[PDB]
């Protein structure tokens, strides 16, 4: 089906504590495959997935050279923004940037992204047309004008529609074992009395990939949206994900409740019932 490649950059100023921190990570779908950390000893882009380790030194040296240029650029940006917002030299601030591409189930370019945040708020974003910018405030409108005058969107468009998707397709094929797979959730229910007249039923989805999943509880086929505790989908640490959904049920009424699990790795959506 559909796939994505995304890169995430975080730059954090550390006044009087030396150079800003810079962390870059890259993902294909929900699988991280590279990292760079300004504070690490290697000062190189590093593999974080087995399939990318097969790329040669030209790849690693190239990604290293380019990610260092990204780092330097963000070091500059932190100073620029401080100026734009008339902020003290003393405070720590954060620049984030994300960019990448989606391809559809045909593996052709579908969508491109390129956006920045400053101190956790949208700053500037390339619009879906890959030709125009959304500037979040007055400061960002300065950047927007500058990038319009330098024709940055055109250069980004060419990467997002071209080279980005070419990389993505290469990685999908090279890491086919890791990337073109689904791991179906292993499911189970637990039951725990909360009192003499109540029990929590918890529906578990474990060891699944990709992260996208829907866990829902029904009582007599009616969705219990407002009464379900749903935890954020969380990484197992091995490349798979976990999630649970619970309802507190009147003891004796277990048989009324069904948990429904939808996941790409499933032949059919699953229905679990206690008993």
């Amino acid at each position: 089906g559909s796939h994505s490649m995304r890169y995430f950059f975080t730059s954090v100023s550390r006044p009087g504590r030396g150079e800003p921190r810079f962390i870059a990570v890259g993902y294909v779908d929900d699988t991280q495959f590279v990292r760079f950390d300004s504070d690490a000893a290697s000062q190189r882009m590093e593999p974080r997935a087995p399939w990318i380790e097969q790329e040669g030194p030209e790849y690693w040296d190239g990604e290293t050279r380019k990610v260092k240029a990204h780092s330097q650029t963000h070091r500059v940006d932190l100073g620029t923004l401080r100026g734009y917002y008339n902020q003290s030299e003393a405070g720590s601030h954060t620049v984030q940037r994300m960019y990448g591409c989606d391809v559809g189930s045909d593996w052709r370019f579908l969508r491109g992204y390129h956006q920045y945040a400053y101190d956790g708020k949208d700053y500037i974003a390339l619009k879906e047309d890959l030709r125009s910018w959304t500037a979040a405030d007055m400061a960002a409108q300065t950047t927007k004008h500058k990038w319009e005058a330098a024709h940055v969107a055109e250069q980004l468009r060419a990467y997002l529609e071209g080279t980005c998707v070419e990389w993505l397709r290469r990685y999908l094929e090279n890491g086919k074992e890791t990337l073109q797979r689904t791991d179906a959730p292993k499911t189970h229910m637990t039951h725990h009395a909360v009192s003499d007249h109540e029990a929590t039923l918890r529906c578990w989805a474990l060891s699944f990939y990709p992260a996208e999943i829907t866990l829902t509880w029904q009582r007599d086929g009616e969705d219990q949206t407002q009464d379900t505790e749903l935890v954020e989908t969380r990484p197992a640490g091995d490349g798979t994900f976990q999630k649970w959904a619970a309802v507190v049920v009147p003891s004796g009424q277990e048989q009324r409740y069904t948990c429904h699990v939808q996941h790409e790795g499933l032949p059919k959506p699953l229905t679990l019932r206690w008993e």
Binding site: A24, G26, G62, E63, V67, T73, D77, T80, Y123
Partner: peptide, 9 residues
């Protein structure tokens, strides 16, 4: 692979 050109805000 990442962008091969950079630009400042």
């Amino acid at each position: 692979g990442i962008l091969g050109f950079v630009f400042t805000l």
